[model samples]
Target chain A: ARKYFVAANWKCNGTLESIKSLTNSFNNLDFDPSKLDVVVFPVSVHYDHTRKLLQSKFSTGIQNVSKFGNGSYTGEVSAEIAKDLNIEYVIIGHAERRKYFHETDEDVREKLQASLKNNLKAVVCFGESLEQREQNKTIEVITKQVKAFVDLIDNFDNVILVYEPLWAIGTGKTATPEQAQLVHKEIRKIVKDTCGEKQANQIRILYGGSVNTENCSSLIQQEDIDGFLVGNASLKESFVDIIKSAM
Target chain B: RKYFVAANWKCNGTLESIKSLTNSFNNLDFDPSKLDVVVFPVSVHYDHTRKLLQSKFSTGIQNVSKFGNGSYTGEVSAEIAKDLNIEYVIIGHAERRKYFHETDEDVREKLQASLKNNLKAVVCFGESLEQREQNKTIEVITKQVKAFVDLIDNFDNVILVYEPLWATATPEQAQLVHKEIRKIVKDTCGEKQANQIRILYGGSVNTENCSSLIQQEDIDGFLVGNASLKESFVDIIKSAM
Candidate 1:
């Protein structure tokens, strides 16, 4: 099913009390869950408080998955572990994983496969780096990425694909609505090509970059651009507004 | 306080499993107050489990190193666990000991450090694939253990989890009986230490095998595996009785 989902990847950020306060603050604010899905992927340590606050109200998403079935994998949270916390969404193949952790499309593919088995919605990510785009391989990168993972799954409906262009993420370079739709339209066509237009139209294709509260409306208004998987601005009060306008 | 069993659910199971397991254990009637039982949950929902556990059970942290606290990217320390109100810590699971090259001396130092920080230690022991096949079980487990824990020879609040190297999930491979393993623990530490120490048998233990093992004088309880998964865990707890 298409999701109006916004995943806040709070990577390597915040303190215990601060995160608690952040979640407590968020818990106080009311949102119509039926209208849109809101979830945050904080550092694993904070997943507890964040998840508790989320409850039946909103949703909780994890940024990573551990490969082991049980016992022994360190510095990684498994999809099963995420499921244990009642977390329904997991972010895979994010630019951070690709850029910092040297994660590849294959890694995302396996995680997507595992997330499906773990019963969590796989938020499969795709995009090109600043250099890849400069090389004009935007479509090639995005298509290869989508085909690589989405092709493996029998149920594409169980996954939500979030496309974040590397050039725009954390750089404060916002994609104009039309500019974003240009890529998102290609993403839709690829989805249609691989899974069919009905499946393509049903997928939640999001544009994530410097998706701040300031320019959320334009991007949210795009036809194929469903929502956002935000970054930097996700840590502040501006996050509240980004979701408001984007949805 | 001399022995404990800490089940580290390192990146394992799903919500259906956790809820089913936790809920069953929460309401399960039996209690093995003799053994210190702690289930180390995934750090993602560690705090939530504490609240989830609250009056029901005590939690042991699966991880936490001697490194006090710093900019070490994805690490949490004993201080943090204690700060979070976590009680026990599984110091050296065989995997961390192997993959991370965490030495016995490192465990000894960490054990000392944990006690300094007022955390109890449940140190793990077992031979690897090569050692087990070479019939080096006693020789390997003894030597490596002495190297790491000899300094704390008279230690209290230290529990030993005797996990069969090959039997973690392949119970069929657990050729050595509980009696034979207990003999080795006694040889390594003498009857006084052996009797005082609580050596929980690990390696694919479930409710079916638990009854016989707990009956042994040396096996106080269990350091269970797949059994810790959910509903099954409470079943194992009842089996512990």
Candidate 2:
């Protein structure tokens, strides 16, 4: 069975002082890492500090990395550098990144390739907008998004997929348990058809976009909904409760 | 008068190389009081570089999100840079403009964010090869500088860098452009503020050209790129002094 994966994308938030407090709260939480995999993605600036403060049970990830390696591209954080920092996971193709930074499918693909090349576990995000959902094009949009990775990777061992509906992210709206499960199940089928059943069963598909304690238990109980890619609540102590829900 | 020398390590360096590079910098012979030096390492190494370097060398980030702290993923905001004890941020670099599609308006937003957070910004602008060939260098530069007219009140915390695209400019050519940049500043912010601001020359700057580049009338210092990764970056710094 796929281990439950819970990740906190601090996204472009947190200061050193606040991260210190949050790490303190995170360190005090008790959970079996054997059954659940918990990772926290802080802004790249806070990566070093947060890593030192957070306990071993909680792994650290970069919110994003450059599609290119170490070179003359200014302001870019490459996967090689992340690896140098001993970082294990990298979040690629987040909805906010694609929406705000104008990252195209090719850009996300290159970033994923870079992450995997450096042997970093990649948490690649995919989602459809509210308009697409309303237009009943959710599966069509999502299938295209997931197919971007189909032939790109040789295996799904280090790859994690996140289904973050653009409309639900940070809007205080969430995909209800059943609604989330439906898309997740379809996503798994898409994987199964493209990459085979064994690969599909092993790949963990998580739900993101307004994932919080209120909705986490119900969301996790859904068969295909593996875990969550949490946002705002990740900054608060309640992030601990979200992890326990997975257990 | 204080001189500025900044190294845009720019998406380069590793833990091993950074340690060796910072150690070389820590042993360099210079008075920090006379020269304001900062190294803008990649964001991932910000805290590590801060701890590696001596107090004489301050740390900086290469970029900041045009917006403030919020849900913008994969971005480091100026407010966060300030909180991390980062003293400077390089906004509007040519690389960011060319590759990231950052507009003049985007640069202005980033500059505003930097100043609001009390972090000094190295604002970059220059003409592309075609513009320079057409003798449109002055016009292109004037327009780019004018984009920040509304932010003149906070010009005290801003540094201007003229980094020509397509090719590196000769020292004399670089000096000419630097003079035009200062004149543009003078026209907008008055002579006092214009002269008070430092205009740096970037673009394949090396040890041989740096001494002559710094000796130019308007070239205050350099935003060293490729040369910043080596031990001889100290030689470039000494030439400026």
Candidate 3:
């Protein structure tokens, strides 16, 4: 397997002080880089502060970035500024962002273009909701997201795909390991068919949905599940154990 | 009229820049007793800048989320702004309305959220370059202003800003817009609400023209933008005096 990549999607939770203690604990713990690469994603307001505190201990990502340049979008942070601040990864098209902020498929593509222009890695997420699953078009719903993403970009070699089922996210209900592997397998096929197998094998597909210490081990054991894009469990000390589980 | 001078830092400022600007604020010689002065910093730096300035000068946020504390990713809520002791929030800025797909309903939802949080809104209204050239200035401004007026009751502490794109408004042009804004408030609510609200002029406001702009009867204050980041912001504030 390629090096396992784990990310803590801190989402909208954390002040400068919250990150201070979190990073302090995180930096002290030992990591087997041969087994995993861990990164932290924080809200944009705390990006600079978190980057300064965490330094080189772990990679850092901004929760969102603007599709356009840095001149005028008042509340929106852009990819140019993110690159200037040395922010390495950008979490775009998050389900939370897509549903609440009225982000469209086109919006995420523009953001990905902007991120690549500034040389930032993209950790893009896609998912099917309970409604889509109830309709029994789980694979089709995710394929549409996959098609929109692949159709926009010329390459997927640098992108990391996170498959998070909207229903299971934050609901404490997780897709069983087999179910997660099934989707991961199907998503890989879409990438292979669209971009060819070389890019497909090069990409990492992560499982994100109620990912916690209790279920992380089984989820990571799946053949197609490259690593985890952990949500709530990432906020705790046990996240270290979750990382160690990769070995 | 009591001046409600405000500065919108917009999408600029890092920690280093924030330190330099706040240091400049310490040396600025404006009296809080004279005109109400407020500074709107980018959301990332709002809390630190607010703590740095304290109650000496009021602090405002450049934006607030339409929804309260739930589910909206990458958005900071008015509840969070109020917790940080932010006294004001700038809504419907031309930059936001232009780039972020913000409409009348989006701007109104933000204002209502601000009001519910007890944060005074520095609500913005303006026309585009095309709208202005088409002679739809009054119509555009009224439509924007009416969106807020018809939605809320009793405009007690709301401060209105008239930012008409990039060109600086002549004193005569500014009064016309400001007068029409007050007329909308009067027609929609009552004469009581119209007289209570202070409508400020924005868009490239600087020291040279600020004296002329603020002296107009309908123009109550200035919403200083790029000039606010400089030391000469003091001069703009002095123009109000």
Which candidate gets the maximum lDDT versus the true structure? 2
Question: For candidate 2, lDDT tens digit of each residue in B1-241?
Answer: 4678899999998898999999999998788888989899998888789999998887789998998888898898888888877889998899899888999999889988888888988888888888888999999989998997558565546888888885857888988888888888887779788888888887788888888888999998889999998899999989877
The Cα error of candidate 1 at residue B176, in Å, is: 12
Worst 10 residues of 3 chain B by lDDT: B148-157
CA displacement after TM-score superposition, residue A241 of candidate 2 (Å): 0.6
How many clashes (backbone N, Cα, C below 3 Å) per candidate?
5, 0, 0
lDDT of candidate 1 over A37-63, digit per residue (tens):
787877566666666655476677767
Worst 10 residues of 1 chain A by lDDT: A67-76
Worst 10 residues of 2 chain A by lDDT: A167-176
Tell me what TM-score chain A of model 1 achieves: 0.91
- Give all candidates' CA lDDT scores: 0.68, 0.87, 0.79
Top DockQ: which candidate number? 2
lDDT (Cα, 0-100) at B17 in candidate 1:
59
Model 3 interface root-mean-square deviation: 2.8
Q: Which number leads on TM-score?
A: 2
**DockQ for each numbered candidate:** 0.22, 0.87, 0.39
Ranking by DockQ: 2, 3, 1
In model 1, what is the error at residue A140, expressed in angstroms?
3.6
**Deviating ranges (above 4 Å) for candidate 2:** A169-174, B154-156
